[PDB]
């Protein structure tokens, strides 16, 4: 009888952890502690020291992605925020100092003898919460986190999580990763709530009466005009095979009524001036049966997108890892703290049935800065007699691997492969996680590259697909949230993608660099 | 209408890989290669050089478990066997040499720079089949195996697998791990067949007509008297809650019609003179819904037992690891090559529903020679409102871990804990897997100990069970297959187990070192 309301398509709900745009490595506390200390505090202090440097940096597109505050006009509120959160920072530096002590002062004292004494000397922040052992040489001690006891600790604190609602008025997004997530304008609403909260599911599922929205707003502890603003984000609430390239590395599929979404990133709608025919949140089906993530890079598992869709998701598939290290924290446990309750980790070449499809994980090597990170896979999906490979940014640095893989998995019809063949220094993503820096020129040799032409070619030659699509190029303007979009057919990447398309056509098959949305047969 | 036959209860079917009694570390080829080279070849050559040393060693019980051939009388056949398998050995040393080359000559050349060149230089045995990366210091290169491509390689060879049938005429078993598995007597039958073969399931399931046994025997490539001997191993084929300690660390449970078996080791029957009231293969239910293995030690996952029961098993639970190293090869993949088709790996404090029970994995630290081995867990089973902890040989070397664990899991009613508080040097299990030995006195500090009294006490104090049972003591005589059974209440272990039982009673609860079979309430 009563009117029902749902979240507007043009309102974004941005994830925030400890004051910053939320992504994987900010959830576990030991990795948060490293980022806060080695990066975020340095960004605030630098900024507070001379806001004009940042202002001046932000003024040039080519500096976008550096350690700059973009809301540089808001010095007072940023300072007030930094000042207020100083106790969060001191609690968290306890953990930072504990890991330093373990790595620098405790582990190096031992040289092959029983490691029992170490446990007796642990800092309290880590007592009961780590395991130590020797590496392959039997003499150099190392450790790993007992991940769930870390999340149970005082240092993982849900009260430091928030979302920020705001309108979306264009396709393009400003780089967000280095700016505190404050209520910078009155169109914005910053709300304290855990990212896993069923309250956010209520929000995204919608279909609420007006008095139900008020109840919800009260459960968020909103009153007054803030509740009114909240209410204003809502509006009256308005079957066979598909293969839909939606953007970057994100692909949607349907097969005999089972739905799939790989490497999810979606754009918004309801505002004038954006590009036509984009696949947005409004275009999603009711249920996403299988959500597949290839690896733990920002551009392939976007928190903002994951939360907006959580309520529709059945099962999440992801790469398996037990490293339980600062460079390679447990991905399934991250997704579970985001509130995904049915997450399955898949090892190399394991197979899982999904609806009428079969999924197989494929070895993914490279693009991780030669770090010890196990959390990465390609996904092969067999949809009946048609098989599709999502390779994401996986490389072909290991000659023959794909030949050996083909011998086991058989033929593949279609391949999606990414060709960001020149990428970031591995330290611009991972550097705050190091114990210390590498010498600058050495570091510079460690980069996050996808396949170049030759590599991509050998992949194709080895698997013999009829269709090849290059993808994951960070061209869509909404990807700017997380990376520096700036195209031009000089860029070696574009050249190489072209060479590859060439190559595949010459050999008598279809190929194309996908750029915006594309329907495909399957 | 026709008579049906089943395998006798007093015929053992012993697993064999590459001529040796089969256990986990002989299945993956890279680990097999290390054992063949660093141990098994040395045992044969030593023996062939002076059979009397071994004869003389074997004559003394206290030397049992050392590197001795027990079938020392059979020099000719052993030599003939060694001679014939020499090509298996040369193929496998190719792999051994490849890993040496990778570890000693390739990885150490690099010091922080991109590792791409390494892939170009790999020995052919490892091309396409490893991933290299840096450790935590960013400068010391390391690697891991791409496990499934190793099993696809020529170096994993099912044709080198066999079983050996033989009568069991007493409770006690001779130590088997260091004697080639040859047809030493006419009561014995050695048959070439993969350990995963459905042929063995046919054997163990039984219910075959006499002409069906002949078909089976033909499928094993048996004829003549060997087929007749095979036939002779068969004989005419002859509902609510339980908790049954069956032996060593092995426990059986039923709960609302769901069946469970932890750390499976069973004894045989059908021969006179054995102990009364043992729980043997004949005592198993039709289906084992859930098979749980705490860790990858010989005494907790006995191939011989696992194969005899495979056909009855639903699902196997095991600890999760991605290390994919020689010290810590993938356990789920080992079980899958044994032919278990539904294996699930569980991380620390993850929960899984099993029938009407819930299972939770618990952190297991220690007893692994401070090696980097992730493949180990305790299992908590919640059977309705009653909860049982199987700790196996897990220790309490990390003070507070159990307190922190209790905070998450809540109360536990019953605990099984193992108190082999003085155990083997870690090198007597793992030493052939090392790249090189440790200095002798250092090595001697690395041992495989379970909890002693104080440790075991703090575990109990932290979890507050009403019932405590010490278990995993290697007392049952059939455990001699795999360890040196030799009891006496001097042994510090027995003292400490006693102290613990004491402690628990004093605090007003039940406790006992279980010794042979015991029914229990649940
Ligand atoms: Fe990536
Ligand atoms: Fe990417
Ligand atoms: Fe053990
Ligand atoms: Fe044991
Ligand atoms: K917490
Ligand atoms: K299929
Ligand atoms: K093979
Ligand atoms: K229960
Ligand atoms: O990525
Ligand atoms: O063990």
PDB file of N, CA, C and O and ligand atoms in Angstrom, chain B residues 248 294-300 364 367-368 392-393 420 429-430 448 472 483, ligand 10:
ATOM      1  N   UNK B 248      46.173 -44.923  19.353  1.00  0.00           N
ATOM      2  CA  UNK B 248      47.083 -43.816  19.141  1.00  0.00           C
ATOM      3  C   UNK B 248      46.336 -42.471  19.235  1.00  0.00           C
ATOM      4  O   UNK B 248      45.925 -42.034  20.340  1.00  0.00           O
ATOM      5  N   UNK B 294      44.742 -34.238  11.416  1.00  0.00           N
ATOM      6  CA  UNK B 294      45.219 -33.058  12.112  1.00  0.00           C
ATOM      7  C   UNK B 294      46.485 -32.568  11.414  1.00  0.00           C
ATOM      8  O   UNK B 294      46.688 -31.365  11.201  1.00  0.00           O
ATOM      9  N   UNK B 295      47.341 -33.492  11.010  1.00  0.00           N
ATOM     10  CA  UNK B 295      48.617 -33.054  10.444  1.00  0.00           C
ATOM     11  C   UNK B 295      49.348 -34.138   9.727  1.00  0.00           C
ATOM     12  O   UNK B 295      49.025 -35.296   9.852  1.00  0.00           O
ATOM     13  N   UNK B 296      50.384 -33.745   9.019  1.00  0.00           N
ATOM     14  CA  UNK B 296      51.034 -34.625   8.049  1.00  0.00           C
ATOM     15  C   UNK B 296      52.263 -35.327   8.636  1.00  0.00           C
ATOM     16  O   UNK B 296      53.398 -35.167   8.160  1.00  0.00           O
ATOM     17  N   UNK B 297      51.995 -36.055   9.713  1.00  0.00           N
ATOM     18  CA  UNK B 297      52.904 -37.007  10.332  1.00  0.00           C
ATOM     19  C   UNK B 297      52.309 -38.388  10.116  1.00  0.00           C
ATOM     20  O   UNK B 297      51.095 -38.592  10.221  1.00  0.00           O
ATOM     21  N   UNK B 298      53.265 -39.300   9.910  1.00  0.00           N
ATOM     22  CA  UNK B 298      53.102 -40.705   9.523  1.00  0.00           C
ATOM     23  C   UNK B 298      52.110 -41.474  10.413  1.00  0.00           C
ATOM     24  O   UNK B 298      51.294 -42.261   9.945  1.00  0.00           O
ATOM     25  N   UNK B 299      52.197 -41.181  11.703  1.00  0.00           N
ATOM     26  CA  UNK B 299      51.419 -41.809  12.736  1.00  0.00           C
ATOM     27  C   UNK B 299      49.966 -41.263  12.804  1.00  0.00           C
ATOM     28  O   UNK B 299      49.128 -41.797  13.535  1.00  0.00           O
ATOM     29  N   UNK B 300      49.658 -40.208  12.047  1.00  0.00           N
ATOM     30  CA  UNK B 300      48.291 -39.671  11.983  1.00  0.00           C
ATOM     31  C   UNK B 300      47.649 -39.759  10.629  1.00  0.00           C
ATOM     32  O   UNK B 300      46.464 -39.427  10.490  1.00  0.00           O
ATOM     33  N   UNK B 364      47.573 -25.006  15.611  1.00  0.00           N
ATOM     34  CA  UNK B 364      48.473 -26.051  16.061  1.00  0.00           C
ATOM     35  C   UNK B 364      49.868 -25.461  15.857  1.00  0.00           C
ATOM     36  O   UNK B 364      50.286 -25.195  14.734  1.00  0.00           O
ATOM     37  N   UNK B 367      56.036 -29.040  17.359  1.00  0.00           N
ATOM     38  CA  UNK B 367      56.262 -30.431  17.012  1.00  0.00           C
ATOM     39  C   UNK B 367      56.667 -30.635  15.559  1.00  0.00           C
ATOM     40  O   UNK B 367      56.626 -31.758  15.089  1.00  0.00           O
ATOM     41  N   UNK B 368      57.060 -29.576  14.867  1.00  0.00           N
ATOM     42  CA  UNK B 368      57.484 -29.710  13.445  1.00  0.00           C
ATOM     43  C   UNK B 368      58.888 -29.204  13.196  1.00  0.00           C
ATOM     44  O   UNK B 368      59.259 -28.854  12.067  1.00  0.00           O
ATOM     45  N   UNK B 392      45.845 -33.552  18.914  1.00  0.00           N
ATOM     46  CA  UNK B 392      46.933 -34.424  18.450  1.00  0.00           C
ATOM     47  C   UNK B 392      48.215 -34.079  19.202  1.00  0.00           C
ATOM     48  O   UNK B 392      48.133 -33.953  20.433  1.00  0.00           O
ATOM     49  N   UNK B 393      49.370 -33.954  18.512  1.00  0.00           N
ATOM     50  CA  UNK B 393      50.679 -33.570  19.134  1.00  0.00           C
ATOM     51  C   UNK B 393      50.909 -32.067  19.188  1.00  0.00           C
ATOM     52  O   UNK B 393      52.037 -31.630  19.264  1.00  0.00           O
ATOM     53  N   UNK B 420      53.641 -36.986  23.809  1.00  0.00           N
ATOM     54  CA  UNK B 420      54.955 -37.466  23.431  1.00  0.00           C
ATOM     55  C   UNK B 420      55.968 -36.320  23.629  1.00  0.00           C
ATOM     56  O   UNK B 420      56.476 -35.738  22.652  1.00  0.00           O
ATOM     57  N   UNK B 429      62.849 -37.419  10.661  1.00  0.00           N
ATOM     58  CA  UNK B 429      61.826 -37.358   9.685  1.00  0.00           C
ATOM     59  C   UNK B 429      62.200 -36.543   8.447  1.00  0.00           C
ATOM     60  O   UNK B 429      61.956 -36.963   7.313  1.00  0.00           O
ATOM     61  N   UNK B 430      62.727 -35.346   8.650  1.00  0.00           N
ATOM     62  CA  UNK B 430      62.797 -34.391   7.530  1.00  0.00           C
ATOM     63  C   UNK B 430      64.145 -34.193   6.831  1.00  0.00           C
ATOM     64  O   UNK B 430      64.208 -33.539   5.781  1.00  0.00           O
ATOM     65  N   UNK B 448      60.804 -33.255  17.613  1.00  0.00           N
ATOM     66  CA  UNK B 448      59.371 -33.295  17.359  1.00  0.00           C
ATOM     67  C   UNK B 448      58.662 -33.593  18.626  1.00  0.00           C
ATOM     68  O   UNK B 448      58.176 -34.663  18.769  1.00  0.00           O
ATOM     69  N   UNK B 472      47.755 -40.382  21.598  1.00  0.00           N
ATOM     70  CA  UNK B 472      48.945 -40.283  20.709  1.00  0.00           C
ATOM     71  C   UNK B 472      50.304 -40.686  21.339  1.00  0.00           C
ATOM     72  O   UNK B 472      51.333 -39.995  21.164  1.00  0.00           O
ATOM     73  N   UNK B 483      56.803 -46.314  14.023  1.00  0.00           N
ATOM     74  CA  UNK B 483      57.583 -45.744  15.131  1.00  0.00           C
ATOM     75  C   UNK B 483      58.069 -46.844  16.098  1.00  0.00           C
ATOM     76  O   UNK B 483      57.529 -47.938  16.113  1.00  0.00           O
TER      77      UNK B 483
HETATM   78  O1  LIG C  10      53.280 -36.881  14.956  1.00  0.00           O
END
